Amino acid sequence: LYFQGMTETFAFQAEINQLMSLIINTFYSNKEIFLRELISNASDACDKIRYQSLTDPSVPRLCIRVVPDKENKTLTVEDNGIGMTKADLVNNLGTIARSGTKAFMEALEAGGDMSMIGQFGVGFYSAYLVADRVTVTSKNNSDESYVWESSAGGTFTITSTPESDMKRGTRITLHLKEDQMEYLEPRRLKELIKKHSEFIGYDIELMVETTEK
Amino acid sequence: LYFQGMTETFAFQAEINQLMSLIINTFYSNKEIFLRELISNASDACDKIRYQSLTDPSVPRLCIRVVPDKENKTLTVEDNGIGMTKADLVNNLGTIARSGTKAFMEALEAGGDMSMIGQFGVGFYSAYLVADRVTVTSKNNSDESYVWESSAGGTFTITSTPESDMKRGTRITLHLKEDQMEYLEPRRLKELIKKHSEFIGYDIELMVETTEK
Ligand SMILES: CSCCNc1cc(-n2nc(C(F)(F)F)c3c2CC(C)(C)CC3=O)ccc1C(N)=O
């Protein structure tokens, strides 16, 4: 009755921990790939709810939103796709991230590029190229909304609040690094969206803050 | 498997919140009553396990320990009594604290003294006379160990860790206010223990840090 919420703390698997330390510390020059990777993830979540709707009509217009916030120095990638249940968030999609990370690091060793992250299903982690903390708020039809957060110190948290009113989908918030403020600028974001826009079957809306007339 | 622990956050009932704000801010000159109140609480917990042992032998030597720590600026009152389950901690002993607080504040209004706190069953809160944060670690035979913590901001937390190895009883840790450092000194603690020692049916051990010979 007087309950405000709860926070569970988990340690990452050893592999994911190495990936995070690698990404957050790399000098990789083409950091902008993070946007493509998050929009790619968002698109796959919209595909999952779409492919599901081809069996049950009970699960409106699927879209992807890119929201900069110069005040909080954050960048958000919002979608209204399938969403993630607590088991999805708490396990880091389970065997998906673990096998993916091992295989991705094995690819980089053998000659690969950081840009190949997505081929291993672990493109979400590229968010740490431009961010030092990432907040993932997801709501799946089969569960309530949860908040995943990590700053890459070997751990992450799962926060549950009964005061929650989050609709189906995923909201990924990127707390931008001092040097990565360029990803707030709407001219940089427009260029990047257009760059992959033709390859994503869903509308991508950019919500930016002046018209001279 | 990779779980480190959890923290639940609750808001105090309105009455308990007023009691806490009153205690933590009062100029009451005889703050030393906090020790009597905690030792009294500790004794009642030893009585509960004793009265229980008069029916079942399965529930060794019941004692009360007073532990100062000049390094962390903390004072601890440890007992090996009945302990408190999660429901005991999460509800603040339920109807006990709520009715007690209302009745205690009604007594003070009518002419009462802060020292009467214990007659209302809410003497635990007197710990806020000398402390700005109180940590309560309790283990009951019917449950695992939990950690209650509050700094009197209208809320408290319940922390559960699977890494826990706390034996039956209650450990109350008082994070002492700048002006209340006198309660670390072993001469002050010896005087106070002796002052009520004859009225408590359990041994009270003081664990202090020099013998000149
Ligand atoms: C495809 S529909 C269901 C899954 N969708 C998504 C998955 C991720 N991924 N992927 C991975 C992993 F494991 F690397 F693949 C991870 C995450 C986020 C995390 C918080 C679970 C940590 C994590 O490990 C990110 C965003 C979405 C989205 N936008 O829906």
Ligand SMILES: CSCCNc1cc(-n2nc(C(F)(F)F)c3c2CC(C)(C)CC3=O)ccc1C(N)=O
């Ligand atoms: C008597 S055997 C079972 C209960 N024993 C104890 C109870 C308290 N009390 N009493 C109250 C209340 F409600 F004011 F009475 C409260 C608490 C601690 C709290 C964290 C539950 C917050 C709180 O509200 C403190 C210490 C012990 C002990 N040493 O065993």
